[PDB]
From a paper:
The single-pass transmembrane protein HAP2/GCS1 is essential for gamete fusion in organisms across eukaryotic kingdoms, and was likely the ancient sexual fusogen used by primitive eukaryotes before the eukaryotic radiation. Recent work on HAP2 from the green alga Chlamydomonas, the flowering plant Arabidopsis, and the ciliate Tetrahymena shows that HAP2 is, in common with fusogens used by certain enveloped viruses to enter host cells, a class II fusion glycoprotein. Class II fusogens are characterized by their mainly β-sheet-containing-domains I, II, and III (referred to here as D1, D2, and D3). As with viral class II proteins, HAP2 functions uni-directionally.
Here, we report a 2.6 Å trimeric, fusion-state crystal structure of Chlamydomonas HAP2 in which the fusion loops are completely resolved. Chlamydomonas HAP2 glycoprotein (ectodomain residues 23 – 582) with a C-terminal His tag was secreted from Drosophila S2 cells, purified by Ni-affinity chromatography and gel filtration, and crystallized. Three monomers in the asymmetric unit form a trimer and pack against one another through D1 and D2 at the 3-fold axis. In further similarity to other class II fusion-state structures, a U-turn between D1 and D3 enables D3 to pack against the outer faces of D1 and D2. D2.2 at the ‘apical’, narrower end of trimers bears three fusion helices, α1, η1, and α2, in fusion loops 1 and 2 between β-strands c and d. Each helix, α1 in loop 1, and η1 and α2 in loop 2, displays a set of two to three hydrophobic residues that project apically. The Arg185 sidechain guanido group docks through six hydrogen bonds to its carbonyl cage formed by backbone and sidechain carbonyl oxygens in the core of subdomain D2.2. Either as a consequence of omission of protease treatment here, differences in the crystal lattice, or higher resolution, we can visualize 50 more residues per monomer. Because of the large hydrophilic surface exposed on the faces of each monomer surrounding the 3-fold axis, deformation of lipids to fit into this large cavity, or the presence of water in the cavity, would limit the depth to which HAP2 trimers could insert in the hydrophobic core of the membrane bilayer during membrane fusion. These apparent barriers raise the possibility that our crystal structure represents an early fusion state of HAP2 that precedes a more mature state in which reorientation could allow the fusion loops in each monomer to approach and close up at the 3-fold axis to form a common fusion surface.
Residue numbers in the entry:
A (entry chain B), C (entry chain C): 23 to 74, 76, 79 to 83, 89 to 240, 273 to 330, 342 to 588
B (entry chain A): 23 to 74, 76, 79 to 83, 89 to 240, 273 to 331, 342 to 588
The structure:
């Protein structure tokens, strides 16, 4: 979209000579969209006196008369990359091993030279509280289990019936239990994310030459590169000078994951490669010092000194681990709901959308789908400008609402879940044209969706990736909620439009029954 | 504000025929403000050869000569809506019931067939640790309470004096206590908020016809609608083609509530106010999702049963920090001129009425944006010649004062623990609907700068800032009269009125422990 | 950068008379950069009929013929200020005092009239659980310490050997311990931060008068002031009318510190003044009610009722305090890593960059380094406009990568740490010109860096402050990673460029050795 165009006299005072020099250039300001990956528009600058701003006619090394300077602009796919900062490692699933010693002895002493669990060591020094804790059957439980049946739980399901082992309970040796903490061989590295940084590269293609026909005689293509890192560039010789000013505000802000911790499997039916097994967790799920129970990174001190530990069930204090959060999210997928810890809760179902990134192995970035119009200013030493835009018709070749990861299509669960709109369009023209995809005039209590733009090659089909997220703002269950999907060509004309119908199932809640 | 205007030759290559077609249109780029709800400006495009871009003179079906094409733009009120995702339910106030059995027996066994508290059940299976815990008076406390007075607390205020019940303590039956967890009948649904999405709709009114006088002869009004969902539209026939490019960056960013949990009262199937008045928005550090933590929203049976030294602690221990507690705590902050920390009205500034003007569904949440969010719109008309017609009407500041949260008292606030709210009354004294800009500047020392606000006021009507401006001070001292200058600008940046706003700040207060 | 310029007929209908009035003004829209603090560009408006829009020739009170109206724009340094909201106070380091009474008595009763620790008081009422807790040596430990050596830890390192004190253990008096909680005399005030607000002031200098030479005959300089608080202004009389529209989106977003708590030392080899001792903590490090252990603000109830408290080490439950987090971050500085709690983790090493702020004593703001181009619209009653920009060459006079606070330069630790790029440039011209500093064409797995702009006075040297943060997206250890640092003058020409080489050391991780 061209915003401003006109002539301007840019005078430059050379700082060494303090000397003035003025030229009248054409200053065009136009935006570049996120989904604008093809050369659909072109800027043509009328060039008088070609070659070396009229000519000396005619070895001779002179100049030619007239030709148009063609300029187009594309933008690489937009990503939101976060910088990583390592913090600490975490175990996939810490496991408690219960030992029932053969000689009915158990030692968890703090200065115990050799406990029945054994000491860990971070080097030559042994780690505190790594020796677990012991459990003995109380006199009250030996009394109950002998005559009747003890109603008090033991962590090792101890049998304290006197008849179960009379020859040793008589001599005071009661049944004992050892509870040691072990680590899964699978470790994870936890990196704290940073501030989001928009990353892209605008490609400015400039070609200078020697009813409906506009034939091109020999041109020489030159490509400029603009971006946040290099927000300006100039063409060969000194004709075109560009400058990236910045983007406009995004209508739907980025997800607030700046203060979360990215879990990456520490390397030593197969697991999927790259970031498929990655996770991104809030700090309320973690214990950095390891002194808290039922958190990622629970340590020895938390497991050894848990209150009434011998009276609790096995594996207590060891919940909420990376393996638990993973298995929990997989359950949410089977129920049409969105994961809460897997990084695919932003992609919408597939990990393939996150491998198109061009960063290093230890990097994280989400594909931006909101509108981010970057403003570029072109200043050419050529008076006369014209915009040439391709208009190709299109057709919506398919639209449907599907749950997370496409486990089932047609609808989702009202407020606990959300839907994902996959839209298939096809360029029916013979040229590469830009398109705008909008969802509007929905039924009641349906959340508005921001439009998306697709640059489709001629005769090719395209699809929204990642798809649009669809919510509903009530908890009822409707059989056919409606929305209108419209396909706009360039310069804002509707080439095709259909009505998208979907169901929402009612929401479900917890309940406790009192007695 | 008009930004760019000029002529441009837009050539369109029809993709089916690969055929070129060029036209010279006027491309105007202008911004639309957040608080711009009235038609104060108008763009007039000189239209030669009316009707069907000169005419064939003269059934005839021909064209007329000349008239101006009038175009205006308004913007709906701006909101920041967050998508909800349900997580779990939470009880308004879990209550501990203390039982003192008549037969002095108490059973909290894990496999106990029938405990003195009873098992809950999530269906047909009974919930673990729902049977509470029992307490017995230790031998040490029976020894103290019999002769002197025991200094050790019991959760049930047990009387373990032997003389208080000798016939049963002698046969070993000591006084016992049962501590069961119960739930308030009022439940709450907790929805995790999502990413903020700016939502609005720009209304482009276009009317084509067919000293100071500019009379309108018959016009036909056509309204276009642009927004984030539909960022472009075209008029009837093919005269005007619009496109919404986006907004500019906001100077004061939105509140970071993306990862918080919205608490909504769960319906049952002196009265409370309707809609979101009873809603709350909490940080995840106030919650226990698994319920295995004490003194958090959603504390479960396992946390209450296995609390360390539970029988030695006071009643209702581990049951603090609940939805009822956080609510009653915020109400106390209101009575002390401070701002709530959990009620969603801590963003509105005092009144819930500002949040019911939203047009979303029953289960939605949105805050009214007050920062400048200037959206850029590009107009391209097939009519060469353009003119901007803006209404300028004078105004007067009819009132300005600093008030605490919810207007419990005006005149000032508490320095750093609290903040003030600036209510400003203005009145359009002209006969036309003009736009205005409201600024607070040239303040005294250590006063935080405030971003300006814009008000579109109907002719002869009075307007007011809603929600009011939030005012802070960057020191902890107590001043009797801090000053700021409130200025009212008409359109095209002229000061019609200005007054000096004076307010006091009380000194901040801090906690203190006296050791012994 | 000038974006749009042209003529526009702005008609104004006076609301009182309903009367029309039209004038044709020049509407220039141009951006103002973040680092643009000098008058490098200038807008010159051709003014016909000077003095009072041709003249009446010739007391006379008439007008002159012709002169140019010079207009320049600068922007103050950009800051992101956060509003503070006080919450509660916190102690620098709560300390546990262990008492061993001479008479072997210990009382921690709830209704105890006078305990061996003593009651605190918030006024006239005494604070609950302020009397600490007592510890007695169990019969099991007296049995072990008498014959052999007890392997169970006591919090007071108690000696329960019967022979160590036989005359009192015989009469039942066992060794006892008192554990009271005390507070460091240094307190801290904790303020919850608010939403970030961009704060700046654009200075519009307008002076109206009355080969390379352009001499100035007497002008009168007038300065306008625009900003978020006052986004518009008009010149003396009614010539120029300005309006600040807003900034463009920032490419690298601000750090998400909105919901954190700022710790400020509560006033009564010396510490540096202002914010040098300040800290900014996540709410997961705090206990507001004080009922949690090993957190900032741990209270009496947490310390008194800690499970197995008498069996734990001294100072247990009292970790993770403001003194601990401070001493921990200082250790990260000595290891080339970035602090996690000190507010200097955003500045990059020096506190001097945070004292240039102009706020009150209780305020907090970070210097914005991302591009924030503000759009300003100028409308002058003078047809004819010209842009005069100074171009002075520059030279990169130094570039190096240094760890946090400059503890050592040359490189950093790959993912646990980050580097900081200090760049020295010098204006070699005789005029004040603007510059653009870019880092591009890096080696593999190097994170992209957004460009920065420097306004340098003539003949003066400038430096990046705060320096650019440099990350790497892999965990390997390389001896010489390369990037290209380029220096652009105004209107986008490369005056100087060098290649910046640096090393990255491999990352380090935790490890537990099992037994
Ligand atoms: C939009 O266009 C897309 C194509 O560009 C459509 O995707 C197609 O979806 C259909 C089902 O709706 C798939 O047909 C199925 O094919 C499988 C076997 O092929 C697949 O096998 C495995 C899965 O077992 C998979 O990993 C492979 O990659 C194959 O894709 C049959 O068993 C099914 O019965 C069914 O016929 C197409 O394969 C798929 N095409 C592509 C290219 O992926 C999409 O449905 C369209 N959406 C809308 C809303 O119109
Ligand atoms: C970019 O230019 C900067 C100057 O504008 C350069 O900073 C200079 O860095 C050198 C070291 O490379 C310093 O020289 C040192 O001086 C100390 C003694 O002076 C200092 O003493 C104390 C520290 O004990 C300090 O607090 C004072 O302020 C003094 O600065 C010697 O003991 C050292 O051996 C060494 O010679 C310069 O003093 C310093 N200049 C300034 C003005 O700070 C910077 O290195 C340049 N960077 C690049 C990449 O080129
Ligand atoms: C700005 O203008 C509004 C009105 O547009 C002012 O609100 C008015 O405030 C007064 C109090 O100062 C209200 O009068 C009171 O009414 C209550 C009954 O609700 C009565 O008990 C009191 O004795 C008193 O009479 C008045 O009703 C209210 N008007 C409206 C429409 O709400 C506001 O005070 C003005 N603020 C400034 C700073 O000028
Ligand atoms: C991801 O895959 C790419 C190629 O598809 C590979 O170069 C890269 O090393 C992989 N990274 C991880 C972390 O698996
Ligand atoms: C929008 O949909 C409603 C049905 O909900 C229909 O009545 C109306 O005509 C539609 N309007 C447009 C412009 O599609
Ligand atoms: C709800 O989901 C089930 C499958 O889980 C589906 O059969 C049903 O049709 C859905 N509800 C409605 C109203 O369609
Ligand atoms: C809020 O009030 C509106 C009408 O004022 C009503 O339509 C809506 O259902 C209410 N929502 C709730 C959650 O009470
Ligand atoms: C701002 O107010 C102060 C009084 O505190 C006054 O001295 C100064 O002149 C005022 N400045 C302007 C520009 O009004
Ligand atoms: C501080 O607040 C009290 C009421 O809490 C009020 O009476 C007093 O006037 C305030 N301080 C000043 C300086 O006005
Ligand atoms: C910081 O220093 C400035 C002067 O450099 C002083 O005016 C201000 O009071 C100081 N603030 C604090 C909190 O030390
Ligand atoms: C980037 O640097 C490499 C040296 O490793 C050089 O070969 C290449 O030409 C450079 N590319 C550009 C565009 O400067
Ligand atoms: C890694 O750091 C050490 C000091 O910690 C330094 O001596 C060494 O040079 C660094 N690595 C490389 C490759 O330079």
């Amino acid at each position: 979209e061209v915003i401003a165009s006109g002539r301007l006299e840019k005078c430059v005072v050379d700082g060494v000579t303090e000397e003035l020099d003025c030229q009248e250039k054409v200053v065009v300001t136009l935006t570049v969209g996120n989904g604008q990956s093809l050369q659909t528009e072109a800027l043509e600058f009328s060039l008088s006196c070609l070659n070396s701003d009229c000519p000396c006619s005619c070895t001779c090394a002179c100049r030619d008369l007239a030709a148009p300077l063609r300029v187009s602009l594309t933008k690489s796919p937009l990503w939101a990359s976060y910088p990583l900062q390592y913090l600490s490692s975490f175990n996939w699933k810490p496991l408690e091993v219960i030992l029932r010693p053969s000689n009915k002895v158990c030692k968890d002493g703090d200065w115990e030279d050799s406990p029945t669990c054994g000491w860990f060591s971070q080097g030559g020094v042994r780690v505190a509280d790594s020796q677990g804790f012991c459990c003995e059957c109380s006199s009250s439980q030996v009394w109950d289990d002998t005559f009747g049946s003890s109603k008090e739980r033991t962590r090792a399901n101890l049998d304290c019936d006197f008849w179960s082992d009379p020859l040793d309970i008589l001599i005071g040796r009661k049944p004992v239990s050892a509870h040691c903490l072990t680590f899964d061989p699978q470790w994870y590295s936890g990196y704290e994310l940073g501030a989001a940084s928009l990353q892209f590269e605008i490609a400015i293609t400039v070609e200078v030459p020697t009813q409906f026909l506009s034939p091109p005689a020999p041109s020489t293509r030159e490509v400029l590169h603009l971006g946040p890192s290099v927000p300006l560039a100039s063409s060969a010789s000194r004709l075109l000078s560009a400058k990236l000013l910045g983007d406009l505000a995004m209508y739907t802000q980025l997800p607030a994951i700046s203060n979360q911790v990215l879990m990456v499997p520490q390397p030593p039916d197969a697991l999927a490669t790259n970031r498929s097994a990655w996770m991104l967790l809030d700090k309320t799920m973690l214990s950095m010092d390891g002194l808290a129970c039922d958190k990622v990174g629970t340590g020895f001190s938390a497991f050894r000194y848990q209150p009434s530990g011998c009276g609790r069930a096995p594996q207590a204090c060891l919940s909420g681990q990376l393996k638990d959060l993973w298995e929990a999210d997989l359950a949410r997928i089977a129920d049409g709901r969105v994961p809460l810890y897997m990084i695919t809760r932003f992609t919408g179902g597939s990990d393939t959308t996150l491998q198109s990134f061009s960063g290093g192995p230890l990097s994280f970035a989400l594909p931006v789908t909101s509108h981010s119009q970057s403003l570029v200013t072109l200043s050419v030493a050529a008076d006369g400008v014209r915009l040439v835009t391709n208009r190709s018709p299109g057709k919506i070749t398919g639209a449907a609402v599907c749950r997370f990861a496409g486990t089932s299509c047609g609808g989702f669960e009202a407020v606990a879940a959300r839907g994902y709109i996959y839209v298939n369009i096809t360029n029916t023209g013979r040229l590469d044209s830009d398109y705008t995809l909008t969802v509007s005039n929905c039924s009641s209590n349906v959340r508005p969706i921001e439009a998306r733009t697709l640059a489709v090659r001629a005769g090719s089909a395209a699809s929204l990736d990642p798809p649009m997220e669809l919510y509903v703002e009530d908890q009822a269950a409707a059989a056919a909620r409606t929305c209108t999907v419209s396909l706009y060509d360039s310069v804002g004309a509707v080439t095709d439009s259909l009505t998208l119908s979907f169901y929402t199932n009612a929401t479900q809640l917890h309940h406790h029954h009192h007695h």
